[PDB]
Structure 1
Amino acid sequence: MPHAFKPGDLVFAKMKGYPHWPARIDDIADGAVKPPPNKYPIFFFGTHETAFLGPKDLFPYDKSKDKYGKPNKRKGFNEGLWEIQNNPHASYS
């Protein structure tokens, strides 16, 4: 059975006006800004951007990839597909 989300989990993450996007739950570095309560720091593959999202907008990657893991015209999306499949745990700093 599922646990709560944890750093390193792979997802597609949804935000308004954007397709379901390949992403991971990030750690918070010592000294870094902490997320709001009940939100997680989401790192978006390809764009390398970060947003704070709650579980309603996080779809586990294994279950969802068949629906959401197809090429998209949006900037960064296809690079992000490569990252989540091929090196989802690397430093992209």
Structure 2
Amino acid sequence: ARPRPREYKAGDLVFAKMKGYPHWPARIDELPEGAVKPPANKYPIFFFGTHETAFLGPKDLFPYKEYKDKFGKSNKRKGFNEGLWEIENNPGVKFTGY
């Protein structure tokens, strides 16, 4: 019913989905102008816990608060439980957008 966003803003907290991985606590990073532009509708993603990065479209992104109940369960994948801690307690770690 309620659709997920088709646009995100730097700072937004999400779960982000990559093949092979559980839906992962993540953050939309800023895209500095004066940099090479990414493909359209792809956002720079920061994964909590692992501090890995990637570019993902809205199809793979899930607003954190709305989907927390579903995706915020403990998982033994390396960095995941640390990620859950950070999205709650330190969601601005290494964030340069503001």
The answer, yes or no, to whether TM exceeds 0.5 is: yes
Partner residue in 2 for 1:54? 57
Hey, which bits of structure 1, 4+ residues long, moved more than 6 A? none
State percent identity of aligned pairs: 79
Gaps of 5+ in 2: none
Residues 5-84 of structure 1 mapped to structure 2, 5 A cutoff: 5-29=8-32, 32-84=35-87
Which amino acid counterpart does residue 55 of structure 1 have in structure 2? P
Which amino acid counterpart does residue 87 of structure 1 have in structure 2? N
TM-score when normalising by structure 1: 0.88
Cα distance between partner residues in 2 of 1:47 and 1:34: 25
Query: How many pairs are equivalent?
Result: 92
Which amino acid counterpart does residue 56 of structure 1 have in structure 2? K
Note the aligned Cα RMSD (angstroms).
2.0
TM-score when normalising by structure 2: 0.84
Gaps of 5+ in 1: none
Which amino acid counterpart does residue 84 of structure 1 have in structure 2? I
